[PDB]
Amino acid sequence: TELALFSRVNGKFSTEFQRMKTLQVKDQAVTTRVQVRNRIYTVKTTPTSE
Amino acid sequence: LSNRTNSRVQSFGGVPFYPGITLETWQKGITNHLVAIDRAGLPLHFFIKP
Numbered sequence A: 001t002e003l004a005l006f007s008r009v010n011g012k013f014s015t016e017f018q019r020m021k022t023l024q025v026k027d028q029a030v031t032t033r034v035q036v037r038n039r040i041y042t043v044k045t046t047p048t049s050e
Numbered sequence B: 001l002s003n004r005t006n007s008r009v010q011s012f013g014g015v016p017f018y019p020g021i022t023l024e025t026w027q028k029g030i031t032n033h034l035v036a037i038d039r040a041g042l043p044l045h046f047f048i049k050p
């Protein structure tokens, strides 16, 4: 704002506002599953066992 | 972001499988670990013969 009256009385009025805002959200979800199954032999009793 | 990996290995015969194995190593490892991949037979009464 500027105001000059009678070419003698001067006035100035300068205002400024600034608002900055920042947001960040970061999600990670890692899920690992390992499953090993070895079956080597099948052992059975002989039918003639005692 | 979304990653989804599924690995499934199924082995019959040969060295116990592990993920980092090469088919070369596996193929050279069946030298003693051989299993029955197919079989044919006869009914039981067919062998009860005079």
Ligand SMILES: *[C@@H]1O[C@H](CO)[C@@H](O)[C@H](O)[C@H]1NC(C)=O
Residues within 6 Å of the ligand: B003, B005
């Ligand atoms: C997993 O996600 C990455 C990014 O983090 C991507 O480059 C890749 O292609 C995806 N798949 C595998 C098997 O890594």
